[model samples]
Each structure stands twice: as C-alpha cells, then as structure tokens.
Target: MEIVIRTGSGDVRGSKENGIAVFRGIPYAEPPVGAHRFTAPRPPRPWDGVRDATEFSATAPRPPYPEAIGALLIERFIPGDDYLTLNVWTPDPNAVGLPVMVWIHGGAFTNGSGSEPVYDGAAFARDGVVFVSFNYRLGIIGFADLPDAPSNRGLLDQIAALEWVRDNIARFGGDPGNVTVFGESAGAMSVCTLMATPRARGLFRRAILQSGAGNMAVAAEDATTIAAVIAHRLGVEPTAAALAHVPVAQLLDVQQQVAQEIQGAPDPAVWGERIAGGSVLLPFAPVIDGELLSQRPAEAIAGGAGHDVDLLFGTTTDEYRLFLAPTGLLPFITSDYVTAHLAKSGLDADAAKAYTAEGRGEEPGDILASIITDQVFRIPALRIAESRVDAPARTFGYEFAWRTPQLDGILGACHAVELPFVFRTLDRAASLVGTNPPEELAETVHNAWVRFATSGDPGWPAWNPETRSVMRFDHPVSEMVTDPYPATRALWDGVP
Candidate 1:
C-alpha cells in the first residue's frame, strides 16, 4: 500500500510492506551535484505535490571499483544525489507521538548506504517505533578537506538531515522532540561526534552508540596534509575553487589511487594505525575545525558536552576480530604473535607486561583482542561514562557478548554483531549469526534499546566512575563489573 504525508515543501508517497510504512529515497536536502559538489548540504527544494518515494534513493557519490577492491569498499556502489535522502519505516504513521529512532549506517565513513539490506528498518518499526535512515556524502565528496571546500561537509549533511526530521517527522506519526539518533561502527562514531557538536544539540534527546566511539576526529593540520596529498594526485590545486571544477569521477579515481597507496603500505605518518580495514577508501574524516567541532568528541564528552542528554553505549565482545580474521590473520594470533602485535602498536610491553605481571588471561591473542576492543570501543565508552559520573544525565553501558557460529568460531561477539539486535532484525544478522539465533540475547538487547529510545533509562542502574558498572548482555541479563577490562582501561586513564 502507498501512503502520502505532507512534507515541508509538499506531500510525498511511501510504500507499505509487512505492516510497516516505508518511505524510501525521500530527499531531505538537494543533491550535492555539480557546483554544489563537496559543499555543505543544502535543503532540497520543495516540490509542489506528492513525490514518489517507492524506490531506494541514490547513494552518496563514491568511486567505481574493480571486482576485487569492490568487495572491500562497500561505499563504491552507492553513488548519486540520492546521497542526501532519508528513508522512514513506521508501524503506524498515524499513531500519535511514537518514539523515533534515526539510524546511521556504518562503513568506516568510507563505505555503506542507508539501503544496505541489513539496515532494513522494518523490524524497529514493527515494534511500535518509527525508524529513519539516511545517506550522507562519503569518501572524497563527503570528506576531502580542501582550502576552498567546506571541511566536514559530511557532518554538515547529517545536520541537515536531522534538521529535516525536526521539521517534518511529526506528519509521519513521530514526536519531533523524542528522536533518538543512533548507528554502528563509523556511524556510531558520528553519533559520538554529534553528541559533542554544538550544531547537533537540541536535535535529539538521546543517543545509542554501537561499537564505534569518537576517538579519531582529525586535527586541522593533519586534515590539511591529507587533503594536500589527494590534491597533488589530481594535478590540480587542492583549493576548494579548483576542486569544485574537477570531474567528480576523476577525483574519485584519485581517491582510489590514494586508498591503494594506504592499503599497500599505510602511512603511519598520516593515519597513525587508522588506515586499517575500510578507512583506506577516503581521505576525509570529521574535521576538528575548532568551530563546528570544538574539540575531539572524547575530550568534549569528558568535559561534559552530552552529559545532560540520555545515553546508551555498547560494543561487541570482539569488535576488531571481524577485521582481523577476515584479513586471514587468525591463524597467526597465537600468544607469541599477539605479544609482537601489541608491541608494534606500542602496547605490547606495557599491556602484556601488566597482564602477565598480574597473571590475567595468559593467552596473548585473547588479551590483545580484548585490549583492541577496549581501546577502540569499550574503553572510550567507559571514558564517556566516567566523564558523566557527576553529570546531570542518566547513562548506561552494555557489552554484546553473544557470538555467531557462522564466523567459523573465529568471531566472538565481534564488532557490529549487535546491529541486528538493536534494529530488531536478528534475521538479517542470521547470514553470519546462523539459524539458531540468539533469540534470548536479541530480546534483551532489543528491548533495552527500545526502552532507552523511549525514555533514556535503559532498565539498568545509572553508570558512574565509582561503580564503573555496565549492563552486560550475554546468555542472560546480568550486571558485570564495569572495569572488567582493567588493564586496557588503565591504558587510557590519562590518554586523550
């Protein structure tokens, strides 16, 4: 069935499926095409009448890829002005004032689209929540910092989309004031950034950050240097005015070339261990422009930016294993190898020394995995919680420990594993999670998310530095000591 809702400009039609109203490819802003390319997102010009929203919208502008690279670069295929669109799934668009969950898809800020099959928001909608997903510029178009170009245009796009929700979601049975912004991986990182962003304040009442944290916002000087590398490849001045005229396709080609360079041998000087996984596809990241982004998100939160906003943060037990195992490094992850690996990351001697000195889990691999998970995700979240220990907001923390057998026993509640649960789409995670789904675990995580989205209290005791406590999600609902990963946690005690 098709349903029409009045928009800021006019009415638009969305299709209904499985008892959920889905408005796909609905433009929230004008396409960033031609001269508008690489510019901050602008509101889409309103149409006079109903616009068809049946088909999926165009994805953000990403470069074309060869078959081999395409498998690794998820963002390579989602190209177009459609990047500036949003999709909504609601069980009852006519229902009054339902809680709203806005999901941001994750692909390390380099790959991913709102239309990823796994991201279908129908499950969340079926649970009496309004699910919204949207696309933002990625790779070069979204990030590439240039002198004349707007830095963090991708973030600008997100702000614009949230603005659209604030203004128009009411017509679709959503309470504009009750929106909860959430995402996983880089998407989660974006949520963390949003938490600290002055521009994003008052746009959402609560947030759910899954797997990713805000630890990687780039310094202006660093961003400029990276931008210069891309500009040098294009044989054009890296200035905004010059880049505005370069063919988007050629610029994309340059992006791929730069990515390949990083992939072949990542530049520690440039990325500092950040060029791993899919971070290779883009040279841009959210800019610490010193204005739009006042400070790195972790610092901002520690200083109490989102302390007043209700928060729910979580991470998979083995967040980085998916990246490690898939890359064929699982076999070498023995105790000795892990020690060598951590040492390479400048943590082996200290962490392993500390772990061995204390006689904790002696298996170096497991310790390394735990260390990486904590450093990249869990610890940062804990830091955010610790920062809020005395703040005015209510906070809760969780760890998704349910693993999928499909990982061939390699992935142990790895990163992004809990996505399906949060979105209430366990079946989607089934491709990796298998037929024997973690129904019990799914229910727990799913319900807690719903509760958090509805009212900020995720059915757990408040998180505080003293307690260092968290709501752990595994076989059954239970409380785990907050500083379970103490060695790694201490590593970041004074780390900025």
Candidate 2:
C-alpha cells in the first residue's frame, strides 16, 4: 500500500490499491497562519524528506450544514493551519499523460472539503483518468472582503492548487494541459469564477459544473457589509488587522450565528441585499473584487471568457427539495410564502403559472421547491450554457433526472445525490442514495464524465441555441432531450 511520489513541494508516501496510486494531504501551499492568514496562498515550504500523504489535509473551517439536511451528507474536518492541501488518485504513478480531472468541493462557500468520503477519487482513476481534489479557504477567512486583505482569498487558494496541478500532476500520470476542473453547488460557483478570472487563465482547459453555474457572486459593498456584521458579532473592529489574530473557534461561532440569523429572518438590511433569500441563500461567496474578479461570471462568459474551455454543466431536477423535503418543511410551506419568495427573487406571477400549467408539481410546497430549484439552480445553469452557445470549444448539458429511492422516494433527483453515482462510492451514501442504489446508473454517469474529460464530447449532442439539447440521466432510461420545458425557460427572458 506504500508508494512514494515527488510533488512540487516535497517527496510524499501514499497508498496503492487495486492498480490505483492514491496520495493524500500533500501541501500545495504553506499553512495560512501567522503572517499569511487572510492573504493569498503562498507555496508550501518545501520539505527535505518524504512526507506522509496517507491522510486528508486539515479541512477548511466551516459550520455544520443545517441539522436536518446534513444527516444525508458526509462531512469531516481535520484541524490545523496546514489546511491548504490536496489529494490525488492515479491509475498508475508510473504512467504518463493521462487525462486529469480535478474536483473543487462545495458547501455554499461556507463548508465542505475534498476529503469527504463521497469525494474519494478512486473511480476517476479506475476509468483511466487521474483525479485530484483539494481544499480552499471557506466562510469568513476565504470570502471576507477587507480593506487590508485581498478579497476572495478562497478563489486565490483554488488558483494556487490549480497552479500546483499545472506544475506537478504529470508526476501522478496526469496531463497538465488536459486538466478538467469540475464541482457541484458552491464548487461550481468557484469553477465559474475560475472560468472568468485572469488569475486562473490557462490553468484548466475544461470544466464540469453540476448543480450551479455562473450567476453567483457577491458585490463589494455586500461583502464588506458582511465582514462588518461578523466584526460586530465578535465585538471587534472590522479591520483585517484587528480580526486576524482572533482565535478561529471564536470566529467560527460568530460565523455560524450570522448564517443562522440570515436564514431565520433574512433581513436585507441586516444580511446585505443579494444574499438574504431563496434556498441558495448564502452568507458569503466569491466577491466582485476588481482584482480577482471584474464582473459576474456569466457576463464574462457572455463576453467570451473561458470560451476556449470545453464545458459540461447541469442541475438535478429537484435540487432545492434536498433542503426542504428531508426536513419535513415542504408540507408546511404555504402558497403565500411561495408567492412572496417568487416576488423577492424577481420572478413575475406568470412564472409560477408556467410551472403549474405544465404540471411540474402538485402541492404548493412542491411547486415552491421546483421554482426555487429553477430560479436558484436551474436558470443559472442554463444561462451560463446559453451564454457559451457560440464559443469555440464545445459545450454539453445534462440533468440527473434519476429519482432516488431514499427516504421512501421523497428526495427525488435532489442536490448532491449525484455525488455517489459520479464517484461510484454508492456505499458511502446511504443517506442520500439509499441501500440499493443503481449500479448501472453509476457506470453510465461516471463514464460520461470520463468521456468528457478524455476528448470533451461526453457522448451527447453539444448544447446549441437551436435545440438546447440536454442528456437526461435516470434509472432504466437516459436520453437526449431537445428544448425540454420551453415555456418555463421562456419566462426567464426579461427576468434577469
């Protein structure tokens, strides 16, 4: 089980099993403590001898997901300042020029790590691809916009990891020039930003964004106001200098409380204008800092940024249900609540009628979940794809239409349900996928990703403005559907 490999920073010992060489906890950057806290990532101080990469690196600091929702997901954290690290799964450490697929874990820019069991890279390696997953800063440390510290340190962390991949992945049997970065939810948001930022230019040639797209970002004023709120909660000045030395545990307490306060009340005056509504409600995210990011990611894509990179992005059919259905809150949501939510999200009354008219769902809460899924996840996904319609590189789309049998069929094609299938780690996801998940679907979905990473075709028709073709993945049947639900999509015409 022991194999030693040389990374850019040092020599590291990893484990080999069933033809795959796995490396964990390799430092791409130095510990972000002392002088480096809240700053751009710096290279890991090179080591003199072989270091153990048999364990995951320290995870980014984050609060737990909402109690009811977290039960269905896998989350783990290891503490230390050396949290900026990555893991690799290679078909053969000795092989060369294999296609590379790197993963960025998502937790709403607040939680999640590369080390989550569901994210194990073994499947990608099994399929002739070298897979890499890494940690980035999160929550306040990562996204806080400060006067002194550079904004969006989390994105800078992702750039540093990609740079590490560009420099070191070949040693792990990967082709640096053929790397494909993929992620879900907030991870997709990070990929979207990476797609736009000049700092991330030339680092990746392809991307797979699942459950999220380019329509997410925080304005500078909103980010600044959020940092000020965190400061007020901590009883300290909002200056980076004042908050830099505060104990992390104390800061985490305030961070958790701030998120809860937003969810409970979501006062725009209190939580900033853009972050206070919808199931995708987030207290922090990639900031529109003039440096790292200049405009919304979709705007950059619409103007032809990242157009050379092959793109495959989509969302599950029932994304927001993962938040509500499992918590037993779906039954409690009233039509008035859904109505007000639609208004707050800037959707016209006609949008609601379009969904109901199409018979997308039955109950009011179900309708609300579908609409939220559309407004927050679905539309953003399609808008980014639509923006890239005429780009030089190819773009493809898919929806995980497979309803899970978990929770007695209540979860139904929900968010993050695709992780187990994508990773082929079905046993690790009983809470999300249930006891008897479909093995065939895993084979089909996982290989489509492999196919995409290999040559960027993904075995589906490239998404075009004319057809809007998207692959629908489900049990017993998956097929290419053109312009599915045209009426609902038409509603977004003048919305944004």
Candidate 3:
C-alpha cells in the first residue's frame, strides 16, 4: 500500500513496509552546492505537488572508505546534488503526538549517510515511535574554514534539520515538543555539541550519545590552519571562491591525501592534539567558531548548558580494538610504545601500571587499547554524566559489553557493535555483529531506547557523582552497575 503526507514544503508519497509508513530522501534544506556551498543551510523551496520519497537520497560527497575495512561493513552511496535530506518512519500518518527520535549517523564527521541499510527505523516505528534520520555535509566541504564561508557548516546543516523537525514533525505523527536527538561517534559529538548551541536549545527535548562526547570540537584557528595546508596542496588560496572552483572529486582526493599525512606524519604544529583517541587524528571536525559555538562543548555543559535536557550516553568495552585489530597493530604493541604514548598524552608511565594491575592484561597493545578506550570514549562519557550530577535534569550511562563473534572474537565489544541491537535490526548485522548475534540482546537495547524516548527513563537509576551507576548490556543478560571502571577512570585524573 502507499501513503501520502503533507509536509510544510510539499506533499510526499511513501510506501508501507511491514505496517509502517516509510518516507525517504525528503529534502530538509536547500542543496549545499554552487552558491550555497560552505554557507549556512537555506530552507528548501516549496514543491507544487506530491514528490516521490520512496528512495534514499544522495549523501554528502565523501571519499570511499579503505576497501579492506569497507568490505566488512554495510555502506552505500548515491551521488546527487541535494544531499542535505532526511528520512522518516512512522507507524501511521493518522496518529498524533508520537515520540520522535532523530538520528545522526557517524563517520568521524566525514563519512556515513542516513540511508545505510542498518539504520532502518522500521523497528522503532513498530514500537510506536517516529524515527528520523538525515545526512549533512562532511569532510572538507562541511568543516574546513575559509575566509568567505562561515565555520562548522556541517553543524549548521544539522541545526537546519532539527528546525525542520520542530516545524513539521507533527504532520508525520510526531510531537514537536517531545523529540530526542541521538547518534553514535561523530553524530554523538554533534548531539552534545548541539546542547551547547543557543540556536539548538529548544529543538530537541532529550538526547542520547553513544561512543562520543562533548570534547570533540576543534578551535576555529586550528580548523582554518588545516584548511590552509590543504589549500596549499591544491595550489590555490584557502578562500571559498578559490576552493569552490575546485571539482568535488579533486577536493575529495586532496582530503584523503591530507588524512594520510596527518597519520604518517604527526605534527602538533599542523594537527592539534588527538581529539577522540587512537589514530583518528584527522584534519577536520566541528569547528568552535566564536559565533556559532562560543566555547568547548564539555566546558559549556559543565557550566550548566543544556541543564534542562535529559541525557543518556555510553561507549563499548573495546572501542579502540576496532581501530587496532583490523590493522594488525593489536598484537605488536610494545611496552616502550605504550609508555611513550602515555607520556605524550600527559600521563605518566604509572598509568600503564595501574591498568595492568587492574587485570587489563600485560600485552602492551591490549593495555593501550584499554587506555585509549577509557580516554576517548569512557572518560568523556563519564565526565558528561558527572557534570550533570547536580543539575535539575536527568542523566544516565550505559556500557555495551557484548563481544562480537567476528574475526575469531578479536573485535570484542568494539565501536559500533551495539548499533544493530539499538535499532532492533540484528538480522541484517552480519558485517559488524556477525551471524550469531543474540536476538534477546537486541530487544533489550531497543526497548530501553524506546522507554527513554517515551517516558525519560531507560530502565536504570539516573547517574550521579556518588554511585556512577551504569547499565551494562551483554548477551543473555544486562545489568546495572556502579563505577564499572574505577581503576581506569582514576588513571586519567587531572588529564583533559
């Protein structure tokens, strides 16, 4: 059967899939191309009649992932001009005031489209929630600063999408006043960062952040410097006019080359301190322009930004393993390397000893993964929880410990492992969760998310400074624990 809904901009026709009305590739803002490139998003022009929204739209221009790793995950691309669009899944167009859950996909703020098959929102729709997902500009086009363009255009795209949701979600069976913004990795960083943005204050009622936190934004100066270096490589001035004349394909090629240089040749003068952890020290991320984002997200949150918004966030047990094991670095890390790396991050060698003493294993690579996992994912999540301890709003935390049976179980509970379960779409998750994912666990994670969106509780006591309670999701069973990683958390004391 087919369904039609009248959006503010136009009428859209979607199809029914398993009893839910699913709409795809609906433009939320004007195409960020030509004159619109590198500028704040503009409202999409209204359409005259019903527009076909059955197919996923084109995603932001991004270079393909390395083939070796890309082969293991579910990724797709559809090139087009209008990439700043959104998709929606609703149980019924006739229903009203349904809880809305808007998702932002993550690829370190560079790759990933909202239309990845695994991000299907039908499961959430079946549970009576309105699920929304959308794409934004990425890589150099979205983030690199230039004299003619405003900073953080990617974030501006997101803000535009949320504003679209605020103004028009009710027409799609969602409540504008009851909305949740949730995402993983870079998307999660955007969620927390949005909490600090004045323009985004009333857009989302609650938020869920998985495997990312507020400390991921880079200063505008650092962002501009990275753009200058890239522009130099292209033999052009680092202004919007000069770079806009460059073909998107050529710009993508330069972006990939610069990414390799940042890894192969680490220079604090060029690439600032590593933001998340491990080797993801790329040249682009959300820029902290003094206007759009006045301060770092973590600092702003600590000083009571988003104090009225409820938040739930967490990370996996082996987030760093995803970066290390696939590249064969996990088995060869030496103690000397571990200690030296810790010293570079302002941590003494005792930090390694503390991890080893806490039964984190003697293998340098494993210890290193644990440290990076804590520093990048675990600690940042905890800091967000702790910062909200005394706020009037509610806060919660979780840890996904269900080890993936992929690659002879070496991937462990690595990054993005919990994605399928959260969406209740484990049947299509062989690329990440393997062929034998636990069906029961998917329901557990999915149900918690539904409960949180419906009533602001996710089946656990709220987190606070005293208990630090966290929900641990594992196969066969999940449990609530307090201060799950005390030793590792203590090791990073006084370290930002």
Question: What TM-score would each prediction reach against the true structure?
Answer: 0.89, 0.96, 0.96
Report the C-alpha lDDT of model 2 over 141-201, residue by residue, as the tens digit. 8887889899888999999999999999989999999999999999998999998899898
What would the per-residue lDDT of candidate 3 be over residues 211-322, giving only the tens digit for each residue?
Answer: 9988887777667667888888899999888887888998999898776676465566555554223334446678788888999898999899888988888999999888
Q: Candidate 1 deviates by what RMSD?
A: 3.6
lDDT, residue 437, candidate 1: 70
Number of residue pairs clashing in candidate 3, backbone atoms closer than 3 angstroms, sequence gap of 3 or more or interchain: 0
**Predictions in order: lDDT:** 0.75, 0.86, 0.86
Give candidate 1 misplaced runs (Cα > 4 Å).
Answer: 63-79, 245-249, 260-283, 333-350, 353-366, 476-482
Q: Model 2: runs farther than 4 Å from truth?
A: 268-281, 345-350
- lDDT per residue for candidate 1 within 45-121, as digits (tens), equals 87787899887887876655444333333332554555688998888778899999898878766667888777888
Error of 1 at 213 (Å): 1.8
**How accurate locally is residue 159 in candidate 3, as Cα lDDT from 0 to 100?**
94
- How many angstroms is residue 14 displaced in model 1 relative to the true structure, after the best TM-score fit? 1.1
Candidate 3 ranges beyond 4 A from true positions: 267-280
